[PDB]
A paper describes a structure:
Alphaviruses are spherical, enveloped RNA viruses with two-layered icosahedral architecture. The ∼70 nm virions are composed of two icosahedral layers with an inner nucleocapsid made up with capsid proteins (Cps) and outer membrane-embedded glycoprotein shell formed by envelope glycoproteins (E1–E2). E1–E2 heterodimers trimerize into viral spikes that mediate receptor binding and membrane fusion, while the nucleocapsid (NC) encloses the viral RNA genome prior to the glycoprotein envelopment. Alphavirus particle assembly occurs at the plasma membrane (PM), where spikes progressively assemble while enwrapping underlying NCs.
Particle orientations were used to expand symmetry and generate the 60 unique ASUs (four E1–E2–Cp subunits) images per particle for further classification analysis. Due to the close agreement between the models of class average maps 2 and 6 (rmsd 0.59 Å), particles assigned to those classes were pooled together and further refined to produce a map at 3.09 Å. β-Strands in the E1–E2 ectodomain and helical pitch in transmembrane (TM) helices that were lacking in the initial map became evident. Our ASU model reveals additional putative residue contacts within the lipid bilayer region between E1 and E2 TM helices and Cp. While E2 C-terminal tail and Cp interaction was reported as critical to virus assembly/budding based on mutation experiment, our structure shows that E1 C-terminal residues also contact Cp. Our atomic model reveals extra contacts between the E1(1)–E2(1) TM region and the neighboring E1(4)–E2(4) TM region at the q3-i3 trimer interface. From the contacts of envelope protein and NC in virion structure, E1–E2 dimer 3 in the ASU contacts a Cp molecule that is part of a NC pentamer, while E1–E2 dimers 1, 2, and 4 contact Cps of an NC hexamer. In our CHIKV ASU map, E1–E2 dimers 1, 2, and 4 have a single linear density in the hydrophobic pocket ∼17 Å long that sits below E2 subdomain D and runs roughly parallel to its length, and E1–E2 dimer 3 in the q3 trimer has two distinct pocket factor densities with the top one equivalent to the ones in other three E1–E2 dimers. The hydrophobic phospholipid tail of phosphatidylcholine was built into the pocket factor density of each subunit. Additionally, our CHIKV ASU map has unveiled distinctive double lipid-like pocket factors inserted into the notably large hydrophobic pocket formed by the membrane-proximal regions of CHIKV E1–E2 TM helices.
Residue numbers in the entry:
A (entry chain G): 372 to 423
B (entry chain K): 111 to 261
C (entry chain C): 343 to 439
Amino acid sequence: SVASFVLLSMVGVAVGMCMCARRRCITPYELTPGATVPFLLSLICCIRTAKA
Amino acid sequence: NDCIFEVKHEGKVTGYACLVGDKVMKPAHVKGTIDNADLAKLAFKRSSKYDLECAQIPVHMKSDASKFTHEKPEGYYNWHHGAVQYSGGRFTIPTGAGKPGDSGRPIFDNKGRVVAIVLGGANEGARTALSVVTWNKDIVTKITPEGAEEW
Amino acid sequence: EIEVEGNSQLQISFSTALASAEFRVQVCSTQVHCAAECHPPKDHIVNYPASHTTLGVQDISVTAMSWVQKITGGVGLVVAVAALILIVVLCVSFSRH
Ligand SMILES: CCCCCCCC/C=C/CCCCCCCC(=O)OC[C@H](COP(=O)(O)OCC[N+](C)(C)C)OC(=O)CCCCCCC/C=C/CCCCCCCC
Protein backbone atom coordinates (compact mmCIF):
# COMPACT_ATOMS: atom_id res chain seq x y z
CA SER A 1 0.00 0.00 0.00
CA VAL A 2 2.74 2.47 0.93
CA ALA A 3 4.79 1.70 -2.18
CA SER A 4 1.78 2.08 -4.48
CA PHE A 5 0.74 5.34 -2.80
CA VAL A 6 4.24 6.81 -3.03
CA LEU A 7 4.71 5.72 -6.65
CA LEU A 8 1.37 7.21 -7.68
CA SER A 9 2.19 10.43 -5.85
CA MET A 10 5.54 10.54 -7.63
CA VAL A 11 4.06 10.06 -11.11
CA GLY A 12 1.41 12.65 -10.28
CA VAL A 13 4.11 15.08 -9.17
CA ALA A 14 6.00 14.40 -12.40
CA VAL A 15 2.87 15.24 -14.38
CA GLY A 16 2.22 18.37 -12.33
CA MET A 17 5.77 19.63 -12.70
CA CYS A 18 5.38 18.96 -16.41
CA MET A 19 2.20 21.06 -16.31
CA CYS A 20 3.96 23.89 -14.48
CA ALA A 21 6.61 23.75 -17.20
CA ARG A 22 4.00 24.44 -19.89
CA ARG A 23 2.52 27.41 -18.02
CA ARG A 24 5.85 29.16 -17.45
CA CYS A 25 7.19 28.50 -20.97
CA ILE A 26 4.06 29.42 -22.95
CA THR A 27 2.62 32.50 -21.22
CA PRO A 28 5.30 34.84 -22.70
CA TYR A 29 4.08 33.84 -26.15
CA GLU A 30 0.45 33.79 -25.00
CA LEU A 31 0.53 37.24 -23.41
CA THR A 32 2.11 39.06 -26.36
CA PRO A 33 -0.53 40.57 -28.69
CA GLY A 34 -0.37 39.26 -32.23
CA ALA A 35 2.30 36.72 -31.31
CA THR A 36 3.08 33.37 -32.90
CA VAL A 37 5.14 30.62 -31.27
CA PRO A 38 7.98 29.11 -33.33
CA PHE A 39 7.31 25.81 -35.06
CA LEU A 40 9.65 23.78 -32.85
CA LEU A 41 8.05 24.97 -29.61
CA SER A 42 4.58 24.32 -31.02
CA LEU A 43 5.56 20.67 -31.46
CA ILE A 44 7.07 20.28 -27.99
CA CYS A 45 4.35 21.82 -25.84
CA CYS A 46 1.01 20.01 -26.12
CA ILE A 47 -0.99 23.20 -25.45
CA ARG A 48 -1.95 24.21 -28.99
CA THR A 49 -5.77 24.25 -29.09
CA ALA A 50 -5.80 27.98 -28.29
CA LYS A 51 -3.77 29.72 -31.01
CA ALA A 52 -2.88 32.67 -28.79
CA ASN B 1 -11.91 56.98 -24.78
CA ASP B 2 -11.84 55.03 -28.07
CA CYS B 3 -10.72 51.45 -27.32
CA ILE B 4 -9.87 51.41 -23.61
CA PHE B 5 -12.30 50.21 -20.94
CA GLU B 6 -12.31 51.39 -17.34
CA VAL B 7 -11.93 48.80 -14.59
CA LYS B 8 -13.48 49.52 -11.20
CA HIS B 9 -13.92 47.89 -7.81
CA GLU B 10 -17.41 48.83 -6.58
CA GLY B 11 -17.75 52.49 -7.62
CA LYS B 12 -14.02 53.16 -7.29
CA VAL B 13 -12.23 53.07 -10.65
CA THR B 14 -8.87 51.33 -10.31
CA GLY B 15 -7.48 50.89 -13.81
CA TYR B 16 -8.13 50.56 -17.51
CA ALA B 17 -7.87 47.60 -19.88
CA CYS B 18 -6.64 48.20 -23.42
CA LEU B 19 -7.57 46.25 -26.56
CA VAL B 20 -4.22 45.80 -28.30
CA GLY B 21 -4.51 43.78 -31.48
CA ASP B 22 -6.07 40.46 -30.47
CA LYS B 23 -5.61 40.61 -26.67
CA VAL B 24 -7.49 42.35 -23.85
CA MET B 25 -4.43 43.64 -22.03
CA LYS B 26 -4.95 44.44 -18.36
CA PRO B 27 -2.51 44.65 -15.45
CA ALA B 28 -2.79 42.08 -12.71
CA HIS B 29 -2.22 44.29 -9.67
CA VAL B 30 -5.44 46.29 -10.34
CA LYS B 31 -8.67 44.95 -8.86
CA GLY B 32 -11.87 45.19 -10.86
CA THR B 33 -14.43 43.48 -13.05
CA ILE B 34 -14.29 45.86 -16.07
CA ASP B 35 -17.19 48.18 -16.87
CA ASN B 36 -18.40 46.04 -19.78
CA ALA B 37 -20.31 42.95 -18.70
CA ASP B 38 -19.34 40.87 -21.74
CA LEU B 39 -15.60 41.37 -21.23
CA ALA B 40 -15.92 40.29 -17.60
CA LYS B 41 -17.11 36.90 -18.88
CA LEU B 42 -13.75 36.25 -20.56
CA ALA B 43 -11.12 34.03 -18.94
CA PHE B 44 -7.76 35.73 -18.37
CA LYS B 45 -4.46 33.83 -18.37
CA ARG B 46 -2.89 36.06 -15.73
CA SER B 47 0.82 35.96 -14.93
CA SER B 48 2.47 37.40 -11.83
CA LYS B 49 5.85 37.67 -13.57
CA TYR B 50 4.66 40.40 -15.96
CA ASP B 51 1.74 41.76 -13.89
CA LEU B 52 -0.58 41.11 -16.83
CA GLU B 53 -3.95 39.51 -17.53
CA CYS B 54 -4.85 38.89 -21.16
CA ALA B 55 -7.54 37.07 -23.13
CA GLN B 56 -8.70 36.67 -26.70
CA ILE B 57 -10.90 39.60 -27.67
CA PRO B 58 -14.36 38.78 -29.07
CA VAL B 59 -13.26 39.61 -32.63
CA HIS B 60 -16.79 38.72 -33.71
CA MET B 61 -17.96 41.96 -32.07
CA LYS B 62 -14.84 43.95 -31.11
CA SER B 63 -12.40 43.48 -33.98
CA ASP B 64 -11.65 47.23 -33.80
CA ALA B 65 -8.50 47.55 -31.69
CA SER B 66 -5.38 49.66 -31.34
CA LYS B 67 -2.50 48.82 -33.64
CA PHE B 68 0.78 47.83 -32.01
CA THR B 69 4.45 47.97 -32.89
CA HIS B 70 7.62 46.46 -31.46
CA GLU B 71 10.38 48.99 -32.21
CA LYS B 72 10.83 52.00 -29.91
CA PRO B 73 13.29 54.48 -31.41
CA GLU B 74 14.25 57.02 -28.78
CA GLY B 75 12.24 60.21 -28.97
CA TYR B 76 8.79 61.32 -27.85
CA TYR B 77 5.59 59.36 -27.26
CA ASN B 78 2.10 60.47 -26.31
CA TRP B 79 -0.45 59.23 -23.79
CA HIS B 80 -3.50 60.69 -22.05
CA HIS B 81 -1.64 62.90 -19.56
CA GLY B 82 0.99 64.88 -21.40
CA ALA B 83 3.69 63.42 -23.61
CA VAL B 84 6.45 61.02 -22.61
CA GLN B 85 10.06 60.69 -23.76
CA TYR B 86 12.01 57.47 -24.35
CA SER B 87 15.12 58.49 -22.40
CA GLY B 88 17.38 56.03 -24.18
CA GLY B 89 15.79 53.09 -22.40
CA ARG B 90 13.43 54.60 -19.82
CA PHE B 91 9.95 56.07 -20.00
CA THR B 92 9.95 59.47 -18.30
CA ILE B 93 7.11 61.85 -17.44
CA PRO B 94 6.70 65.05 -15.46
CA THR B 95 5.99 64.17 -11.85
CA GLY B 96 2.45 65.55 -11.93
CA ALA B 97 1.34 63.56 -14.97
CA GLY B 98 1.65 60.30 -13.02
CA LYS B 99 -0.83 59.38 -10.30
CA PRO B 100 -2.32 56.15 -8.92
CA GLY B 101 -5.31 55.04 -10.94
CA ASP B 102 -3.58 55.55 -14.30
CA SER B 103 -2.33 51.95 -14.30
CA GLY B 104 -3.40 50.14 -17.44
CA ARG B 105 -3.48 53.20 -19.67
CA PRO B 106 -1.61 52.54 -22.93
CA ILE B 107 0.88 54.80 -24.68
CA PHE B 108 1.13 55.57 -28.39
CA ASP B 109 3.86 56.59 -30.82
CA ASN B 110 3.84 59.36 -33.41
CA LYS B 111 2.04 57.02 -35.82
CA GLY B 112 -0.69 56.13 -33.32
CA ARG B 113 0.19 52.58 -32.23
CA VAL B 114 0.60 51.22 -28.72
CA VAL B 115 4.14 50.42 -27.60
CA ALA B 116 3.61 49.80 -23.90
CA ILE B 117 1.14 49.89 -21.04
CA VAL B 118 1.90 51.68 -17.78
CA LEU B 119 1.83 50.19 -14.28
CA GLY B 120 3.53 52.67 -11.96
CA GLY B 121 6.39 55.07 -11.60
CA ALA B 122 9.28 56.41 -9.57
CA ASN B 123 10.67 59.95 -9.58
CA GLU B 124 14.26 61.21 -9.49
CA GLY B 125 13.67 64.95 -9.38
CA ALA B 126 11.12 66.65 -11.63
CA ARG B 127 10.79 63.74 -14.07
CA THR B 128 9.21 60.40 -13.17
CA ALA B 129 10.41 57.12 -14.64
CA LEU B 130 7.69 54.72 -15.74
CA SER B 131 7.19 51.00 -15.13
CA VAL B 132 5.68 49.65 -18.35
CA VAL B 133 5.08 46.34 -20.09
CA THR B 134 6.69 46.74 -23.50
CA TRP B 135 7.31 43.96 -26.00
CA ASN B 136 9.81 42.83 -28.60
CA LYS B 137 8.88 40.44 -31.43
CA ASP B 138 6.55 37.74 -30.07
CA ILE B 139 7.62 38.36 -26.47
CA VAL B 140 6.88 40.89 -23.72
CA THR B 141 9.54 42.36 -21.43
CA LYS B 142 8.41 44.03 -18.22
CA ILE B 143 10.53 47.05 -17.30
CA THR B 144 10.71 48.47 -13.79
CA PRO B 145 12.78 51.33 -12.32
CA GLU B 146 14.11 51.40 -8.76
CA GLY B 147 11.60 52.18 -6.03
CA ALA B 148 8.59 52.33 -8.37
CA GLU B 149 5.20 52.19 -6.69
CA GLU B 150 2.19 50.58 -8.35
CA TRP B 151 -0.52 52.93 -9.60
CA GLU C 1 33.91 -28.88 11.11
CA ILE C 2 34.62 -31.44 8.36
CA GLU C 3 37.60 -33.35 6.95
CA VAL C 4 39.09 -32.16 3.65
CA GLU C 5 41.95 -33.47 1.52
CA GLY C 6 42.34 -34.22 -2.17
CA ASN C 7 40.68 -32.95 -5.36
CA SER C 8 37.05 -33.77 -4.60
CA GLN C 9 33.91 -32.13 -3.18
CA LEU C 10 32.03 -32.23 0.13
CA GLN C 11 28.41 -31.80 1.20
CA ILE C 12 26.66 -29.72 3.86
CA SER C 13 23.16 -28.99 5.17
CA PHE C 14 21.69 -25.62 6.13
CA SER C 15 18.38 -24.14 7.27
CA THR C 16 17.10 -20.81 5.98
CA ALA C 17 13.93 -18.74 5.92
CA LEU C 18 14.88 -16.92 2.71
CA ALA C 19 13.13 -17.53 -0.60
CA SER C 20 16.42 -17.00 -2.46
CA ALA C 21 19.62 -18.41 -1.00
CA GLU C 22 22.45 -15.87 -0.82
CA PHE C 23 25.14 -16.47 1.78
CA ARG C 24 28.89 -16.90 2.25
CA VAL C 25 30.35 -20.05 3.79
CA GLN C 26 33.49 -19.48 5.87
CA VAL C 27 35.48 -22.64 5.16
CA CYS C 28 38.84 -22.50 6.96
CA SER C 29 39.60 -18.80 6.33
CA THR C 30 38.51 -19.02 2.64
CA GLN C 31 35.01 -17.75 1.93
CA VAL C 32 32.74 -18.91 -0.89
CA HIS C 33 29.50 -17.64 -2.41
CA CYS C 34 26.42 -19.87 -2.61
CA ALA C 35 23.15 -19.00 -4.33
CA ALA C 36 19.99 -20.99 -5.00
CA GLU C 37 16.21 -20.66 -5.07
CA CYS C 38 14.52 -22.04 -1.97
CA HIS C 39 11.01 -23.47 -2.13
CA PRO C 40 8.19 -23.46 0.43
CA PRO C 41 7.68 -26.52 2.64
CA LYS C 42 4.81 -28.94 2.30
CA ASP C 43 3.85 -29.32 5.98
CA HIS C 44 1.90 -26.52 7.61
CA ILE C 45 3.10 -27.14 11.18
CA VAL C 46 5.83 -29.07 13.02
CA ASN C 47 6.78 -30.08 16.56
CA TYR C 48 10.09 -28.23 16.99
CA PRO C 49 11.15 -24.58 16.92
CA ALA C 50 12.73 -23.30 13.74
CA SER C 51 16.40 -24.17 13.34
CA HIS C 52 17.14 -21.03 11.34
CA THR C 53 17.63 -17.64 12.96
CA THR C 54 14.37 -15.69 12.63
CA LEU C 55 12.00 -14.09 10.16
CA GLY C 56 13.88 -12.41 7.35
CA VAL C 57 13.91 -8.68 7.96
CA GLN C 58 12.16 -6.42 5.46
CA ASP C 59 15.53 -5.67 3.87
CA ILE C 60 15.99 -9.22 2.57
CA SER C 61 13.38 -10.02 -0.06
CA VAL C 62 13.84 -12.61 -2.83
CA THR C 63 15.71 -12.08 -6.08
CA ALA C 64 13.09 -11.38 -8.71
CA MET C 65 12.50 -8.46 -6.41
CA SER C 66 14.14 -6.86 -9.45
CA TRP C 67 10.57 -5.84 -10.26
CA VAL C 68 10.81 -3.38 -7.37
CA GLN C 69 14.03 -1.94 -8.77
CA LYS C 70 12.54 -1.79 -12.27
CA ILE C 71 9.42 0.13 -11.24
CA THR C 72 11.26 2.43 -8.83
CA GLY C 73 13.86 3.17 -11.49
CA GLY C 74 11.14 3.94 -14.02
CA VAL C 75 9.39 6.32 -11.64
CA GLY C 76 12.68 7.93 -10.66
CA LEU C 77 13.56 8.37 -14.33
CA VAL C 78 10.22 10.03 -15.07
CA VAL C 79 10.67 12.33 -12.08
CA ALA C 80 14.23 13.10 -13.21
CA VAL C 81 13.18 14.15 -16.72
CA ALA C 82 10.34 16.20 -15.23
CA ALA C 83 12.77 17.95 -12.88
CA LEU C 84 15.29 18.60 -15.65
CA ILE C 85 12.62 20.08 -17.93
CA LEU C 86 11.27 22.23 -15.10
CA ILE C 87 14.71 23.51 -14.11
CA VAL C 88 15.75 24.31 -17.69
CA VAL C 89 12.49 26.20 -18.17
CA LEU C 90 13.08 28.03 -14.89
CA CYS C 91 16.60 29.00 -15.94
CA VAL C 92 15.56 30.20 -19.40
CA SER C 93 12.70 32.17 -17.85
CA PHE C 94 15.21 33.62 -15.40
CA SER C 95 17.24 34.76 -18.41
CA ARG C 96 14.30 36.87 -19.59
CA HIS C 97 15.02 40.60 -19.22
C1 LIG D 1 4.88 -5.48 -10.25
C2 LIG D 1 4.87 -5.51 -8.70
C3 LIG D 1 5.88 -6.59 -8.21
C4 LIG D 1 6.61 -6.08 -6.94
C5 LIG D 1 6.67 -7.22 -5.88
C6 LIG D 1 6.12 -6.67 -4.54
C7 LIG D 1 7.01 -7.15 -3.35
C8 LIG D 1 6.12 -7.23 -2.08
C9 LIG D 1 7.02 -7.42 -0.84
C10 LIG D 1 7.99 -7.04 0.00
C11 LIG D 1 8.20 -8.07 1.13
C12 LIG D 1 7.63 -7.51 2.46
C13 LIG D 1 7.55 -8.66 3.48
C14 LIG D 1 8.64 -8.50 4.55
C15 LIG D 1 8.08 -8.98 5.91
C16 LIG D 1 9.19 -9.65 6.74
C17 LIG D 1 8.82 -9.56 8.24
C18 LIG D 1 9.52 -8.33 8.84
O1 LIG D 1 9.93 -7.49 8.12
O2 LIG D 1 9.67 -8.21 10.24
C19 LIG D 1 11.02 -8.37 10.70
C20 LIG D 1 11.10 -7.99 12.17
C21 LIG D 1 10.11 -8.84 12.98
O3 LIG D 1 8.98 -8.06 13.32
P1 LIG D 1 8.90 -7.41 14.85
O4 LIG D 1 7.48 -6.99 15.15
O5 LIG D 1 9.34 -8.45 15.86
O6 LIG D 1 9.90 -6.09 14.95
C22 LIG D 1 9.36 -4.84 15.38
C23 LIG D 1 9.38 -4.80 16.94
N1 LIG D 1 8.49 -3.72 17.44
C24 LIG D 1 7.09 -4.02 17.08
C25 LIG D 1 8.61 -3.65 18.91
C26 LIG D 1 8.88 -2.43 16.86
O7 LIG D 1 10.76 -6.63 12.32
C27 LIG D 1 11.87 -5.75 12.38
O8 LIG D 1 12.76 -5.95 13.15
C28 LIG D 1 11.93 -4.53 11.43
C29 LIG D 1 12.70 -3.38 12.13
C30 LIG D 1 12.69 -2.13 11.21
C31 LIG D 1 13.58 -2.39 9.97
C32 LIG D 1 13.71 -1.08 9.15
C33 LIG D 1 14.00 -1.43 7.67
C34 LIG D 1 15.38 -0.83 7.26
C35 LIG D 1 15.21 0.03 5.98
C36 LIG D 1 14.52 1.18 6.04
C37 LIG D 1 14.35 2.04 4.77
C38 LIG D 1 15.72 2.67 4.37
C39 LIG D 1 15.95 2.48 2.84
C40 LIG D 1 17.05 1.41 2.61
C41 LIG D 1 17.45 1.39 1.11
C42 LIG D 1 19.00 1.32 0.99
C43 LIG D 1 19.39 0.85 -0.43
C44 LIG D 1 20.70 1.55 -0.87
